[PDB]
Ligand binder design. Sequence first.
Ligand code: SF4
Ligand code: SF4
Ligand code: ZN
Lengths: 96, 95, 43, 52, 52, 113, 208, 49, 176, 114
Amino acid sequence: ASATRLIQGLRNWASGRDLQAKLQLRYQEISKRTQPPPKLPVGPSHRLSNNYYCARDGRREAMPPSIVMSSQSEKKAVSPAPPIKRWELSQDEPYL
Amino acid sequence: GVRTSPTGEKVTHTGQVYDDEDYRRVRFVGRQKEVNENFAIDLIAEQPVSQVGSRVISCDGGGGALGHPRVYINLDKETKTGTCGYCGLQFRQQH
Amino acid sequence: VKQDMPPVGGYGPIDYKRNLPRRGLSGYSMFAVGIGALLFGYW
Amino acid sequence: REKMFEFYERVSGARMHAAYVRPGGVHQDLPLGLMDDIYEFSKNFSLRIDEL
Amino acid sequence: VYDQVEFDVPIGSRGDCYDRYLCRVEEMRQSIRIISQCLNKMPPGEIKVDDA
Amino acid sequence: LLKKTTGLVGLAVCETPHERLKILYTKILDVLGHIPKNAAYRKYTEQITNEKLSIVKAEPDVKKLEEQLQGGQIEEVILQAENELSLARKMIQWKPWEPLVEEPPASQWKWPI
Amino acid sequence: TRPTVRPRNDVAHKQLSAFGEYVAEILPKYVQQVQVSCFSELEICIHPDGVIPVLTFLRDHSNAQFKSLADLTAVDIPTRQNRFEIVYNLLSLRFNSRIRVKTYTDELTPVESSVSVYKAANWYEREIWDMFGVFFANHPDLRRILTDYGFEGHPFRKDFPLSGYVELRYDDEVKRVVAEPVELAQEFRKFDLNSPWEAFPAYRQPPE
Amino acid sequence: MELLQVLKRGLQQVSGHGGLRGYLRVLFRANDVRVGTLVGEDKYGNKYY
Amino acid sequence: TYKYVNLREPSMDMKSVTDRAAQTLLWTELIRGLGMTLSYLFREPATINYPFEKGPLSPRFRGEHALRRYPSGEERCIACKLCEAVCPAQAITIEAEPRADGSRRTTRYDIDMTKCIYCGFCQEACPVDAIVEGPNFEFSTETHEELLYNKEKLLNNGDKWEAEIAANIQADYLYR
Amino acid sequence: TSVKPIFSRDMNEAKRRVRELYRAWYREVPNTVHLFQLDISVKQGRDKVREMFKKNAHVTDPRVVDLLVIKGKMELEETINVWKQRTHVMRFFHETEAPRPKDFLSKFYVGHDP
Ligand code: SF4
Ligand code: SF4
Ligand SMILES: [Zn+2]
């Protein structure tokens, strides 16, 4: 940022870009190293009522794997899922 | 209160010192034995016993969430002060 | 609450596309400059 | 890449091995002012890709 | 939340070292796009699951 | 209209996709007729192959055939038909409609142990 | 159960159950179990004589098209008489799906190599030779891939100790890196962490 | 011309370290001669700019 | 939602063919590359003057371990061994006894700084903020065993760096 | 009690394979001493190959000796190709290891182990 306008114009010309607009070195535009203290919010389970853990217990609603076939008609042939949708070419920048 | 063995070796706050006939003093030969001279058993005994006017006091070590978990100390013994098991600060019911 | 949040109108638009900005003379012009340099040198 | 390691160090305290993304969320919230610096990095990073 | 961010996927054409190079360059471009969207759409709230 | 490339490396463009698909589907049905009637591989593969062959006979276009066969490019649909043919020729040899060769041990799939 | 619990996917659960029935009745010669977990992942437990007929099916069948071998894995379980559990993770790009094909062997029974199905397996099961000792028949170049060249034993078995049996150091008498029996300056401290209260009643086993 | 300002900033970097002795002192100890605002000095003699 | 890198057919009119042949014979893109490198020649470099200048750090930084005391001189550690239970490398070795006033304190507190992975799980497992991983990263030794810290070295790191560790914990305890 | 073989149908084909592996190792030992510039004699290396074969001489299972032939062929391929260095070849000769006490009285002297 401290460069003279002769070196600045030379540097912009040699790169072919406006380099002073986007300087990779950092100056006073970055955040302060000292910040005010935060007040972080609490989650949804910080409630004094209607907050029994048996109604929000993720690990205890895990089930054993449902056994479909075990060795102890004209029904449709299935796939594991419907076939994947063909992607759309990008409207932003297709390179075509 | 650091002290010194007859071998010249400093005794730590734990009480560790090598014996005279112990070969492992040779690691301090030409070098030093790093002990810490601030004994916590001495520094906590310098604190004044805090006189309070309740039957049960609380202690978190000061600083709020920067100290220890908050404990409640019963002060019904007038023989003994009520000592925090975390910080070692001790309390006495004033009556 | 005080939390690391973006500004109210959001951040500014960030460039992310290729910018190779096409400088220089044409091929006709560069061959003409090279031929003119040769002709000056030969003369 | 050094500035992005500063982003890792500000978010976790380690420049490379953060141990930050944990099962259940992340270990710690963003420090205040971090997203502004991520913005100031990202706004200028396109010119760095362009000159590469 | 990748289903909520908008980005493109660079596709090669010849499978060589040069197309994979260009795919990585354009993935850096699209990563800058995703980072812009993530900085614009960061919600408030907690950072761990509140299952303690 | 002759699509210029498939977009996939090493997958060439098929000039006549419909005739190639009809040949491959009738060849899959021919190989698949050598399998017993009770076999679920025969019934399921005859079902999907007759559906694909009906769709190929129903559509003159290549693009609309790609959008309603729902398998990507038409050339990788041809590739999938060839893989199905090679699979069915192997399934003749393997005979997997036969009963289970061996029951597993008593707690072979018990997890957690 | 909204914010903190993972949302259950019933549609993919139903579709994977139907496709597991499909795979089981197309291939009943080898398929021993079919199961779908609660987080919607399909496992096809097969007999080890049908590694190749199953995996060539799922790679080539027009309703499966599992064209990518993502990962091949062994798991040592010493309480089984077939202590090794060989696990094939497959990715179908066409139907945007993943499947798991599990089979078994012990120390001595070979498994047929799936390099004629997926060339990707060429190192994985080679790793399974190096780490578990599961021999693979008809592998093109079966040898060690991760351990040291003179290494005895197979490390990822659970009767193999955490530290090895030998450690290395440079010996200056012989001018050479040498192997000695391992002696730790500090032993690894085994922690007994398991609580004696049952955590998950859904997974309770019936008693004796 | 803006080269004259560059040479004058160099000469006042020389004059800002307390002459040629301080300039060469900080040049050989620090391998940098730019001047700053003295933020402080500790009990050891470390000077912070 | 996808794009094709390198799916351009170059134009075949005489203008573009002569442009490409002038690029071939007259080396236009090579002069472009030389110009970009010359553009970086006239930039101020990114080099900081270490050790007189220092790399920027945050108060979350995980450096050298230290044991903290209370604002009475009593050490915070009450020998609960949560730091050595959580320690991913088993770098912490703790032995304890009741000392002469009956306080629950350690007799051994070793951190092997050559096993330690500097991940800070010990400081966040600590219920009393006793073990902390401080700001110091400049503690390279000439001997392996000088990195085998015992309780005395850790309490001395606490006494050495407490004026800074207290301010980093002051700036970062509300995120924890 | 009916298992799948590895290579051998019985013990006799297995002993054929063990015999051919010993032949291949016996042929390879002088090349191994020469190109790894080992400071053992060729007789010492052939004695070590004899020792490594005769350690396993008590095995009566065809599958286990099939796997021992397989692992011996892998060691041989890592020795013929220069994949092992000199150190991996010399790890069969426990040179830096002091000779352990073998009788009862000296094991009683040195420690607690049997
Ligand atoms: S930082 Fe991590 S590895 Fe190091 S002592 Fe703490 S818990 Fe152990
Ligand atoms: S440092 Fe903290 S976690 Fe570790 S034993 Fe002491 S009080 Fe417990
Ligand atoms: Zn207290």
